Design a protein around this ligand. Structure first.
Ligand SMILES: CCCCCCCCCCCCCCCCCC(=O)OC[C@H](COP(=O)([O-])OCC(O)COP(=O)([O-])OC[C@@H](COC(=O)CCCCCCCCCCCCCCCCC)OC(=O)CCCCCCCCCCCCCCCCC)OC(=O)CCCCCCCCCCCCCCCCC
Ligand SMILES: CCCCCCCCCCCCCC(=O)SCCNC(=O)CCNC(=O)[C@@H](O)C(C)(C)COP(=O)(O)O
Ligand code: SF4
Ligand code: SF4
Ligand code: FES
Ligand SMILES: [Zn+2]
Lengths: 104, 117, 115, 91, 205, 89, 151, 206, 52
C-alpha cells in the first residue's frame, strides 16, 4: 500500500509508462508471448488455471488482465499478481495436511 | 446496441460482423470448391464453414451469434475465418492430398537410438 | 554414388565458384575498412595475404554444398565485419598471434614433448 | 517493549502515511523460538510392512512406448469434428 | 488406490487421439506418423518438405488454432542417416492444448523457415543455426546468436567436445584478449554411469 | 621453520632440493597435528561376551551404518568404519 | 484456381527470379561421399593427427550384466596427461579425450567418420555366439570325468 | 537335430532341445537375473534368483537349469516371476552387512544393480534392532585375496571354479544351514595361477 | 528427452524472455531512448535463461 501510494498515482510514472510500448494481441500470439505480456494485452491466459499443476486447483485466486498493453497495465498486473499470490499464500497457510514430504 | 470494447487490444469492434463473416465463408467455399472431392480436408472445411454459415444466418444478434458459435467473440471469428481463407488459398498450391513425398529412412524414428537390434 | 538432396543457394559448381569470388571481392573491399577501424597491428597487405591463405586452405574441397556452407559462413564473418560487431581480439584470431609455432622435424618433437 | 519513536512522532507518521501504521521491523516477541522440540516426520502410505509389494507400486515400469494412432485405429477397426481439447474462451 | 503412480487424463487422451487421427487424415502427404506419448502429448512426425505448410495448417485450421509457438528444440542423434531432429512445440489457447511437430534434417539439408507462420522462430531457428548448424532457407536474418563472434563449429552437436577446442586469456605483448589451445588445469573426469542390468522390459521391442 | 619439513599423516613431505618448497616462503604449510592413527590406537579395545556385536558409531543415527562383527576368532576385531576394536575373552 | 488476389511477389518477379526459385525447389544430384571437416569447426591438427577407434565397449568382468555392451561407440586416442605443479590434479591438453559417441552398427560409425573426415579404424568385429549346452545331468555322470566333486 | 518352438515372453523362438530357459531367454534378448549361473562353470540351483513362471505349472522354475520342452510359454515379465524374484532376493538381503561404502565391489556389485532392477524398495527386516543379522569370521585364504565372509551369499561359484577349472580342491562349503561358511576348514592358502579370476567370479565381492 | 540411461539425452529450456526480446525489435521501434529503457524493463528478461 505504501509502495503503490508512492508509485502508482504519480503523474511522472503515468507519463513514463502509459501509451508506451503498446503491443497488440495478434502480435502477442504470433510472436509467441507468454505470461504477463499475454495478460497485459487483454488475453485471458494463466497457466495456473487452464492446465493446473501441483495443487493449484485446490486453491482459489484471481487472474489479472490488462487492457491497453502498455507499461502501466503490466505494472498493475504485476501488483495484482503480488496480491493474489498473498491470497494463495494465505490459503496454503490455512490448510496443509500432515504426512510425508517426498514420494516413497 | 454496440460493444464498447473487446477487452483485448489491437482488435477494434466491427460495424458489420455478419456480412464480413458471410463474405469470408463464401470465399472459403469458393477456394475449397477447387479442391478434389476425395480429399478429406475439403469435406472437413465444408462441414465447418457450412455449420458456421448456418450459425451466422440463423442468428441476427451479435452476442447470440457468439453464444451459438461458442468459439469466442465475433472479431476473433473474423480473424479465424481470415486465417482459414489464407489456408484455403495456400493449400491449393501446397497440394496435400497426394501420397507421401518422402519415405521413412531406416532407424529414423527409433528411441533409444543406440541399440544394435 | 547418387543422392537427391535440396540445394543451398546454388545448383551447380559454377554458381558456387561465382559466390566464392564474390566473397573474395567483398572481403577485399572490406579489408581497408577493417584495418583503419579495428586498431589491429596488421598492415593491409598482410591482411590480404591472410585472406588469400584462408581461401587457399579451402581450395581443396569439391562438394558444392560444402562450398556453399563455406560461402554462408564467410558471408556471416563479412556481415560481422561491415558492422563492427566484434573487437580487435577476435579479428587477430585468424593470424594466431599468441600461439608460438611448433617444430615439425622428428628430432625436435622428440626432444620437446610427446605430442 | 519494542524500540520505536515517542508517540508524538508516531502520530505524525500515522498522519503523513494516510493510514494506521504497523511496524515493518521484526521483533523477538513476534517470531517463533529458535530452539524447537525435536520433530517426528510421519510415515507415508507405503511404509506399512505387511501388505505392500513393489510390483503394484512401480510407476517406472508401467510406462509404454508411444502408440501409433493410425495403427491403433487400424487394429481396433478391423457428429462434431475432433478438437485438441475443451473449448476455452480467452476473449 | 495407487498413490505413488501418476494418474493420467482419459478425456485428454481421447481428445488428442481424435485430433491426431484428424491431422493424419487431413495431410496424407506431409504427415509421416502420428503418435501419442505417455503424459498425454501428441507428436506429429512429418517429412522435411512439410515443415512450413503443416504448422501453417496448425496455425489456421478451425480445429487447429495453435497460435503460440513456444519453442523449437533440436536434438542431435548422430546414429541416424539424417542426423538432427527438430521439434516444434505449439500451444493452442482456444482448445487449451499442446502439440509437437518433429522433423529430421541432415547436416547440409535445408529447412524451410517458419518465420512466415510464427515470428518467434525468427530467433529460435537462429539458435538451431548456432547450436547445431542447420541452414534455414528464406530466413530474414540468419546469424550466430549465442556463441562468440569468432567461434568456429557448432557446440551442442555431439561431435563437438564439452570443453570446446580453444580458451581465451589476456596477453600483454599484444595488449589483447587472445585465443589459445585448450588445456584444463584439471581434466573433466568422465563417469561411467551406464546401466549394466536393464530395468524396463517394455522398451526393448 | 619446521612446518616445511614436517610430514603429514599420509607420509608426504617435500624434498630439500625440490622447487615446490618455494611456495612456502610467504605462506606457512598446513599439517594437521591430530593424526587419526594415534587417536584410534589410544582408545582401548572393548571386551565383549556375545559371539557377534554391533557397531553404530556411538551416536545412533549420527554415527556410521550399523554393522555386525564376529568375535569367535581370537584377537582384536577392528570395525571398518570407525576403527573401534572389540575383543572376546 | 481461386479467383482471389494473387501473390504480388510472384506475379511481378522477373523470369530470372521464377527460374531461380524453381531450381532451388528441385533436387540436385550429389555424391554420397561428403567430407565435412572444414564445416565442423575442428582444428586441422586434430584432423591430421588423431586416430578414431570404433569398438564395442568391454564387459565388466566382475558383473554379469550385458546391457552396456549392447551398443557400439566411437572413442578418440589417448594423449598425454600430466600432473600440474601446484596441487596434483590430472591436467590434459586433449579436448577429444572425453568423448564417446554411441552408434548402432559399425557401418554407421564408419560412414559418420567418413563424413567428419576422421582417420578411423575398427578394433574388433561383432562377437559370434557359440552354442554351449548346459544341463544339470552332466554334473552326476557314470564313467565320465565331468562328475563334479562339489555340493 | 530338430528345433522345438518355445514362446518366451509371448515371442516364438526355435531352440535346440538341450537348451534351458535362460539360454532361450538370452537368445531372444531378455537377460534373466542370476547370481550363481556362469556359462563357463557348472549349473547350480542355490541362489534361486532366476525363477520364472511357465504356464500350467504350480511352482516357478529355475531358468538356469530347467531344460525346455515343446509348447512352453515362458513369461519373464509376469507378476508371479517378479514376486518370486523380490521375495528371494529379500531373503538374500536380510543378512547382508551394511558395508557398501567400505566394499570395493560397490559401484559394480551384482546385488546393488539387481536391487535397483527387479528388487524391492524397502527392507522388511524388523529384527535389525534386536537379535540382528549374522556375522562370520574371515578366513586367510591367500595374500592375493581379501576375504570378508560376512558379505558372502553362498552362491558356490568359487568352489565350482576351484574344483572344475583351477584344479585344486582347497575351497569348500563348511557348516549347515544359516551358519554355512564358504571357506577352507583350516588356515590354508589357496594357491593357483588363477586365483585372481575368483575375484572376478565373486558376484558380491566377499 | 531421455534415452533410458542415467543421464538425460537432451534438455531444452524455453526462456519466457526469449520471445519478448525477439519482439523488442518491433515494440521498441519509433520510440524515445528513455522509452526503450522502460520497455526493456517492461518485458521481464534476465539473460541467464535467454542465453541458457
Ligand atoms: C515533523 C517534525 C517533528 C519534530 C519534533 C521535535 C521535538 C521532538 C524531538 O526532538 O524528539 C527527538 C528526541 C527524543 O525523541 P525520540 O525520537 O522519541 O527519541 C529517540 C528514540 O526514541 C530513542 O530510543 P532508544 O530507547 O533506542 O534510545 C537510545 C539512544 C540511542 O543513542 C544513540 O543513538 C547514540 C548516538 C547519537 C548520540 C550521540 C551523542 C550526542 C551528544 C554528544 O537514543 C538517544 O540517545 C536519543 C536521544 C538523542 C539526542 C540527540 C542526539 C544528537 C543530536 C545532534 C544534533 C542536535 O529529542 C531530541 O532530540 C531533543 C529533545 C529536546 C531538546 C533537548 C536536547 C537537546
Ligand atoms: C582481414 C581479416 C581477413 C579474414 C580472412 C577470412 C575470410 C573468410 C575466409 C573464408 O570465407 S574460407 C571459405 C571460402 N570458400 C571457399 O574456399 C570455397 C571453395 N573454394 C574454391 O573452390 C576455390 O577453388 C576458388 C576460391 C573457387 C579458387 O579457385 P580458382 O582456381 O577458380
Ligand atoms: S556385497 Fe554389494 S550389497 Fe553387500 S556391502 Fe558390498 S556392495 Fe553392498
Ligand atoms: S565367496 Fe563369493 S563366489 Fe564364493 S560362494 Fe560366496 S559369494 Fe559366491
Ligand atoms: S541362476 Fe538359476 S538358481 Fe542361480
Ligand atoms: Zn564402528
Amino acid at each position: 500500500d505504501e509502495v503503490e501510494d508512492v508509485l502508482t498515482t504519480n503523474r511522472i510514472w503515468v507519463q513514463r509508462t502509459e501509451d508506451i510500448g503498446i503491443v497488440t494481441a495478434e502480435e502477442a500470439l504470433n510472436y509467441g508471448f507468454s505470461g504477463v505480456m499475454l495478460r497485459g494485452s487483454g488475453i485471458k491466459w494463466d497457466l495456473r488455471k487452464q492446465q493446473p499443476y501441483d495443487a493449484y486447483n485446490l486453491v482459489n485466486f484471481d487472474v489479472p488482465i490488462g487492457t491497453k498493453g502498455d507499461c502501466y497495465d503490466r505494472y498493475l498486473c504485476r501488483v495484482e499478481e503480488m496480491r493474489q499470490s498473498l491470497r494463495i499464500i494465505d490459503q496454503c497457510l490455512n490448510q496443509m495436511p500432515a504426512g510425508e514430504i517426498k514420494t516413497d | 446496441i454496440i460493444k464498447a470494447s473487446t477487452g483485448l487490444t489491437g482488435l477494434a469492434v466491427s460495424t458489420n460482423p455478419h456480412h464480413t463473416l458471410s463474405a469470408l465463408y463464401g470465399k472459403i467455399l469458393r477456394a475449397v470448391s477447387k479442391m478434389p472431392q476425395d480429399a478429406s480436408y475439403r469435406k472437413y472445411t465444408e462441414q465447418l464453414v457450412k455449420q458456421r454459415a448456418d450459425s451466422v444466418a440463423q442468428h441476427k444478434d451479435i452476442t447470440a451469434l457468439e453464444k451459438a458459435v461458442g468459439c469466442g467473440q465475433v472479431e476473433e471469428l473474423i480473424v479465424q475465418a481470415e486465417n482459414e481463407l489464407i489456408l484455403a488459398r495456400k493449400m491449393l498450391g501446397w497440394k496435400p492430398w497426394e501420397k507421401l513425398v518422402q519415405a521413412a529412412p531406416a532407424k529414423q524414428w527409433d528411441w533409444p537410438p543406440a541399440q544394435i537390434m | 554414388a547418387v543422392q537427391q538432396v535440396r540445394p543451398i543457394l546454388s545448383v551447380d559448381r559454377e554458381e558456387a565458384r561465382k559466390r566464392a569470388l564474390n566473397l573474395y571481392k567483398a572481403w577485399y573491399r572490406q579489408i581497408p575498412y577493417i584495418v583503419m577501424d579495428y586498431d589491429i597491428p596488421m598492415t593491409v597487405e598482410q591482411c590480404r595475404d591472410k585472406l588469400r591463405e584462408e581461401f587457399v586452405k579451402h581450395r581443396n574441397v569439391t562438394d558444392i554444398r560444402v562450398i556453399d556452407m563455406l560461402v554462408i559462413k564467410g558471408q556471416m564473418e563479412l556481415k560481422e565485419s561491415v558492422e563492427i560487431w566484434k573487437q580487435k581480439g577476435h579479428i587477430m584470431r585468424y593470424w594466431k598471434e599468441s600461439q608460438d609455432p611448433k617444430p615439425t622435424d622428428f628430432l625436435s618433437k622428440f626432444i620437446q614433448g610427446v605430442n | 517493549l519494542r524500540r520505536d519513536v515517542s508517540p508524538l512522532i508516531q502520530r505524525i507518521r500515522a498522519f503523513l502515511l494516510g493510514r494506521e501504521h504497523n511496524l515493518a521491523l521484526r521483533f523477538e516477541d513476534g517470531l517463533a523460538d529458535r530452539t524447537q522440540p525435536q520433530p517426528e516426520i510421519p510415515d507415508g502410505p507405503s511404509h506399512l510392512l505387511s501388505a505392500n509389494y513393489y510390483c503394484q507400486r512401480d510407476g517406472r515400469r508401467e510406462v509404454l512406448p508411444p502408440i501409433d494412432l493410425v495403427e491403433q485405429q487400424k487394429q481396433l477397426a478391423a457428429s462434431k469434428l475432433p478438437t485438441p481439447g475443451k473449448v476455452y474462451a480467452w476473449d | 488406490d495407487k498413490p505413488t503412480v501418476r494418474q493420467p487424463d482419459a478425456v485428454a487422451r481421447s481428445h488428442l487421439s481424435d485430433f491426431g487421427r484428424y491431422v493424419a487424415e487431413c495431410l496424407p502427404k506431409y504427415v509421416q506418423k502420428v503418435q501419442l506419448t505417455a503424459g498425454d502429448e501428441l507428436e506429429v512426425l512429418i517429412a522435411p518438405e512439410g515443415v512450413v505448410p503443416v504448422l501453417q495448417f496448425l496455425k489456421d485450421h478451425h480445429q487447429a488454432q495453435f497460435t503460440n509457438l513456444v519453442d523449437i528444440a533440436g536434438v542431435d542423434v548422430p546414429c541416424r542417416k539424417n542426423r538432427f531432429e527438430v521439434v516444434y512445440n505449439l500451444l493452442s489457447l482456444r482448445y487449451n492444448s499442446r502439440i509437437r511437430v518433429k522433423t529430421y534434417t541432415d547436416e547440409l539439408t535445408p529447412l524451410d523457415s517458419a518465420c512466415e507462420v510464427h515470428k518467434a522462430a525468427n530467433w529460435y531457428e537462429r539458435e538451431i543455426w548456432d547450436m547445431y548448424g542447420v541452414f534455414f532457407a528464406n530466413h530474414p536474418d540468419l546469424r550466430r546468436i549465442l556463441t562468440d563472434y569468432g567461434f568456429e563449429g557448432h557446440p551442442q552437436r555431439r561431435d563437438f567436445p564439452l570443453s570446446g577446442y580453444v580458451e581465451l586469456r589476456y596477453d600483454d605483448e599484444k595488449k589483447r584478449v587472445v585465443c589459445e589451445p585448450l588445456e584444463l588445469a584439471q581434466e573433466f573426469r568422465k563417469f561411467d554411469l551406464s546401466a549394466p542390468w536393464e530395468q524396463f522390459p517394455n522398451f526393448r521391442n | 621453520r619446521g612446518d616445511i619439513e614436517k610430514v603429514t599423516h599420509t607420509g608426504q613431505v617435500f624434498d630439500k632440493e625440490d622447487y615446490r618448497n618455494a611456495r612456502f616462503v610467504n605462506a606457512k604449510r598446513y599439517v594437521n597435528e591430530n593424526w587419526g592413527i594415534k587417536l584410534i590406537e589410544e582408545v582401548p579395545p572393548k571386551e565383549c561376551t556375545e559371539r557377534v556385536v554391533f557397531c553404530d558409531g556411538g551416536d545412533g543415527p549420527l554415527g556410521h551404518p550399523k554393522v555386525y562383527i564376529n568375535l569367535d576368532k581370537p584377537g582384536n576385531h577392528i570395525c571398518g568404519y570407525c576403527g573401534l576394536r572389540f575383543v572376546k575373552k | 484456381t481461386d479467383g482471389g488476389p494473387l501473390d504480388p511477389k510472384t506475379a511481378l518477379a522477373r523470369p530470372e527470379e521464377l527460374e531461380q526459385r524453381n531450381k532451388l525447389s528441385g533436387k540436385i544430384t550429389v555424391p554420397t561421399a561428403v567430407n565435412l571437416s572444414p564445416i565442423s569447426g575442428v582444428p586441422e591438427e586434430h584432423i591430421r593427427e588423431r586416430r578414431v577407434r570404433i569398438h564395442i565397449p568391454p564387459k565388466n568382468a566382475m558383473q554379469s550384466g550385458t546391457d552396456n555392451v549392447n551398443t557400439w561407440q566411437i572413442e578418440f586416442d589417448n594423449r598425454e596427461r600430466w600432473e600440474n605443479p601446484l596441487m596434483g590434479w590430472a591436467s590434459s591438453g586433449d579436448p577429444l579425450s572425453n568423448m564417446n559417441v554411441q552408434f548402432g552398427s559399425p557401418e554407421e560409425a564408419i560412414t559418420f567418420c567418413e563424413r567428419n573426415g576422421w582417420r578411423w579404424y575398427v578394433d574388433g568385429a561383432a562377437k559370434p555366439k557359440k552354442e554351449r549346452v548346459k544341463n544339470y545331468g552332466i554334473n552326476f555322470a557314470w564313467n565320465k570325468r565331468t562328475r563334479v566333486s562339489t555340493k | 537335430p530338430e528345433k522345438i518352438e518355445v514362446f518366451v515372453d509371448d515371442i516364438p523362438v526355435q531352440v535346440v532341445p538341450g537348451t534351458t530357459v535362460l539360454q532361450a531367454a538370452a537368445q531372444i534378448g531378455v537377460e534373466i537375473p542370476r547370481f550363481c549361473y556362469h556359462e563357463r562353470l557348472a549349473v547350480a540351483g542355490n541362489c534361486r534368483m532366476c525363477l520364472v513362471e511357465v504356464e500350467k505349472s504350480p511352482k516357478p522354475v529355475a531358468a538356469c537349469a530347467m531344460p525346455v520342452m515343446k509348447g512352453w510359454r515362458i513369461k519373464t515379465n509376469s507378476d508371479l516371476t517378479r514376486k518370486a524374484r523380490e521375495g528371494v532376493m529379500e531373503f538374500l538381503l536380510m543378512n547382508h552387512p551394511l558395508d557398501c561404502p567400505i566394499c570395493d565391489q560397490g559401484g559394480e556389485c551384482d546385488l546393488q544393480d539387481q536391487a535397483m532392477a527387479f528388487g524391492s524398495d524397502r527392507s522388511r527386516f524388523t529384527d535389525i534392532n534386536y537379535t540382528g543379522k549374522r556375522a562370520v569370521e574371515d578366513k586367510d585364504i591367500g595374500p592375493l585375496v581379501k576375504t570378508i565372509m560376512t558379505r558372502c551369499i553362498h552362491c558356490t561359484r568359487c568352489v565350482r571354479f576351484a574344483s572344475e577349472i583351477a584344479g585344486v580342491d582347497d575351497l569348500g562349503t563348511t557348516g549347515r544351514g544359516n551358519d554355512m561358511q564358504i571357506g577352507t576348514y583350516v588356515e590354508k592358502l589357496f594357491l593357483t595361477e588363477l586365483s585372481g579370476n575368483v575375484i572376478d567370479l565373486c558376484p558380491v565381492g566377499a | 528427452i531421455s534415452d533410458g540411461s542415467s543421464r538425460p539425452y537432451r534438455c531444452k529450456i524455453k526462456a519466457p524472455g526469449f520471445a519478448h526480446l525477439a519482439a523488442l525489435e518491433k515494440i521498441g521501434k519509433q520510440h524515445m531512448l528513455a522509452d526503450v529503457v522502460a520497455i526493456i524493463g517492461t518485458l521481464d528478461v534476465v539473460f541467464g535463461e535467454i542465453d541458457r
